[model samples]
Target chain A: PSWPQILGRLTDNRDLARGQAAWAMDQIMTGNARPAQIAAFAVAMTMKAPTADEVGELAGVMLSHAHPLPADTVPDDAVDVVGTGGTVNLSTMAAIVVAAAGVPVVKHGNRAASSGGADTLEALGVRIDLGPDLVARSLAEVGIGFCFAPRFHPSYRHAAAVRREIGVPTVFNLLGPLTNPARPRAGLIGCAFADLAEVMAGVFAARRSSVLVVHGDDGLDELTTTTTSTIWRVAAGSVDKLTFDPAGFGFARAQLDQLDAQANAAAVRAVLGGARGPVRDAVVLNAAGAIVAHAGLSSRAEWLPAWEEGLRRASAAIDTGAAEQLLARWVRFGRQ
Target chain B: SWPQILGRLTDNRDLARGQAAWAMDQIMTGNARPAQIAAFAVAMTMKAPTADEVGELAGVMLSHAHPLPADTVPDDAVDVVGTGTVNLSTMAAIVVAAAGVPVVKHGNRAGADTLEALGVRIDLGPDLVARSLAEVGIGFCFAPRFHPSYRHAAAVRREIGVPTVFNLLGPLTNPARPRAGLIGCAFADLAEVMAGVFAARRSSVLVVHGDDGLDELTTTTTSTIWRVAAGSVDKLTFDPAGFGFARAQLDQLAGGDAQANAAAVRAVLGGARGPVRDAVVLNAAGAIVAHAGLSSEWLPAWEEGLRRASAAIDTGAAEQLLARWVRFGRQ
Candidate 1:
């Protein structure tokens, strides 16, 4: 259907079919749609709050058009730790710790308005814009890799100008973590809102074996130490909602300010070097979630006990200096 | 205030008149980016702009339009229509002018290309359009020629391809600013709102929306009319049966492209008796009644106006006037 036809349906309070949504995104990604059409689509979709089927189809198009990584380069057990990105950058630190705990991690992200995964990773002396080959090799050799979103998804350039001009959150924001070119087998996806967490869980569950979608009660995108967080565990085509409390996990309650850090190279280096604080605790909690997701433990009976064990492994990686050494190896590998 | 204005609209809050005017200025002066323009259009359409919002936006457009010469034509009346499927109002304008009322019709070549099909030169500048009305009793104010500033938004409007505030502004921003007008609205819900726009400007006008979704009064069903005069509005429901006309289906008044519609108009002017003729006569009578000034006794005034319009067609005066205007427009 044409842009007008698709937009007309949307404006009339009707949801687009999965195929129609995919076709609309194809027009946008291929530069066939005008900036005005793209803007209208963005506003209409935002107002309607795109359905999981719609966002899933749109992400499918983006992933299909992205630069591909060699199938063997990304391990079958590799997991991606990312978020919707309106909070501090903990996924980067969490990915390094998860990798140090013996799981291959493919981190897909970009430099957001604040210090994002790519920004912090770059600050840590890792080349953030490596091509697919080097990124794949980094994941294989160092147990983790940074797939700078822009380098992998070149078709997104067509919409970059309109997205910048609109200056509002759109469906494109939700698609970031879902369209990792490496196509990891499992993921820890954090959404900024509860509704979005449910929608993202449905989309990720349709394709991946196990995925954990989290929303912080304190309004952060990732799990928070300030309050209880909602978690959606998707495995074997089913989603189970659960809650995580910092205090329930034998951690002290801390305010958001205590966990907030500059997220620069030195800040990340200190946390990986086992410096004690809420920031480090936050990383350990998030990394524990990722480890549990990668292990495909969805049942409350099994995952509750697994969460404690995962936390122990994450802390061990930091205390033993394994995460710090791994970051060094990844930075050296990125430079070469 | 681009962010504020867009945010307010998306949040379902109505913009004040000045704020809407400011946003329109940004759009018309090329200050707004394409994304902002598109977003504003969709957001406003979703929220459904108010009468004051549309009126203020139209006022901004009028200020930017090239003005028609003062006193070039009498401030008698004009006829305008929203998006329509046929050229009923264009044909009615000729009949109203032939019935001894000065009519300046402001329009575009969108529907059926009726004027172009009739060999009426529609691209006349403001001066020629004024002269045409002064001497020929009718003028055509082609929208593009009068409102050059509309060029900035033209591409965005086309690309978006949905009815926006721009569509509503065209009929409201006639350059002549006629003292009275007969405006047809496509949506019945908008009839009263459009009348409020005219009432705000202190101009008397009749706004009609056919029940069958046509912009003009339909012979098939009762139509809603909002009468605006003296800064007040009165609502009236009109039925063809009460007016002593036989009920006709919408297809009986169906029109084709420019060639077919122009032929239909010519046949109506030549006294072909059928639904097309009746539709034209009914709309022309409304234009005549509006021009002469609306009164409390609308039924009798409308009946008298209908007789005058019927006479203009029966005596062949409308046909002759149309031929003369076409020659004058080309010359």
Candidate 2:
């Protein structure tokens, strides 16, 4: 997190340095940096490696003095599933199941990036909106909360020109997962690179956020159901790697390619409809990891079954109009 | 010169850092290491290199180990510089007028990469660059080779998408690497801009800006001249006639390919030459005048010497160079 000290680290990889700059700038833009030396410090860091001290200092800049969301402990366990979603329209069917499981969830999304049917859960049909006041409200009322990337990351306004001109994924893209204001007890981060997962797992572990950094082997920027996947666990005080076949988790291997935007939308609909096959079961399994991660225990032997019941609550929320109402509520809150 | 070039140097880390980072990249590619390259580049940049350093380094990287022999060896109060201005469809008289005096031209053939790809074999290397001064009385150092650091800089500049210091460094460091210089500066501002840098860095230099926009003397446009030496810049808001040429037109002084330009230089050496030919003679004449402190103006002496220069070219002192070309070019 010491953005400056790490600047020297760029001698090995320029692209990583490029991204880290974006990340720092955005965090600073959020009214986070200390009153003194912030601007000069950021410019210099952009010039060199941002040290770990600078990064940790930056965290203080960001988190210090800013009010956090009111505490809302969900009995089912809470999780935040999100990404910088350049085009992550992966349907939220699995997320829905996880939410349905009496376990509360806070899924956040922005305006659709593609022409597809909505790209984020907010786009899909969820009333969970974002902002400080409402975020605290969501945690207090539903035991879950959401934080919009742009809303919290004002630095994007400054970086808009740079990213548009370069037109590639810079390190700042990972910021969405890193600065979870709700401080999601557990997260299944979808990364574009396998190495990013381990890096993020360490990042979260250092920040003390229970997290499972996940990346698709096929390079989908998420845990691809289509191929073998690698996950890193930053839960229960351990930050390391863990390998698991979807089948072992009671979910069949799925060709994530089959989960196209449309198929993703379908999966979400089917999961909401209580379809209990591979796609639905896989989502439940992913949710179980979140449950275990959030619960911070080894009870997945029991967690998976508990996850299935949570999916039922999620399904009922979806069918009985509660889920749809959640969607309508945020829409009224400017979720477009 | 330093303004734009330095501006560019900052953008590309690899290039801005030049040999510094390049050494690292080179070492990675099994060339020079970061430590070595950095030590050299940083020291050179900060200390300001001597002429020997300039010649030795250029000599090493240049294509051949020799250059066109100056009928007049070593020091001559004369030198001619070509316009490396980016655009050109025709007209290059500088190469021919080169015959009239102890002409030392600094240039490279323009190519996909650099004009160095043209007939001339002036690689942009270091140590080998000496031959440019040793022989041709004319030195051609390809921009990339003469300044390897410039290539690395391209990336940094590309990221910033701009041009800078490398542009300034090109003409400033001539092949002969002389303190006494005759330069063709591209922009009108460059007249004073480059001249000021020369005055700051060396002893004698004539930086000319053709109003028509060529860096060298132009029979066509009224030029702005900044003679840097004797501790100050002297300005000349004048025309080719000031250098003893008939009033010339832009169309009469077009720039072109090496051969065509070389032929134009030949035409100027012929003396009964056209306005463009006279333009180059005028350029060299200014060099002689500046180098010798000739108090005489640029044109009259240029026009007269051009006549003797014409005699030399016709009697085959010029053709004599053709043999020298064959000898030097073959190797």
Q: Who wins the TM-score comparison? A: 1
User: Number of the top candidate by lDDT?
Assistant: 1
> Scored by CA lDDT, what does every candidate get?
0.82, 0.48
Tens-digit lDDT track of model 1 for B293-327: 73336777789989999999999999999999888
- Which lDDT tens digits does candidate 2 get at residues A1-336? 554343324322233443454455544566443311132232223333333333443444344423455554332356776544442434254444445444566654444343332344444454534567776665545444556645664443443333332233334345456655555666666677554456556667766666667765676555555566677777655776766565544456676545445555555555555555555544554555555555553343443564455445544565575544443444444443
RMSD to native, candidate 1: 2.8
* lDDT of each residue in B16-59, candidate 2, tens digit only: 32332333344223343222232233223323333333333333
Candidate 2 interface RMSD, angstroms, 1 decimal: 15.5
Docking quality tier of candidate 2? incorrect
Error of 2 at B115 (Å): 25
Task: Evaluate candidate 1 and give its CAPRI docking class based on DockQ.
Answer: medium
Model 2 spans with C-alpha error above 4 angstroms: A1-9, A12-77, A84-91, A112-119, A122-130, A142-144, A260-267, A275-278, A297-336, B1-331
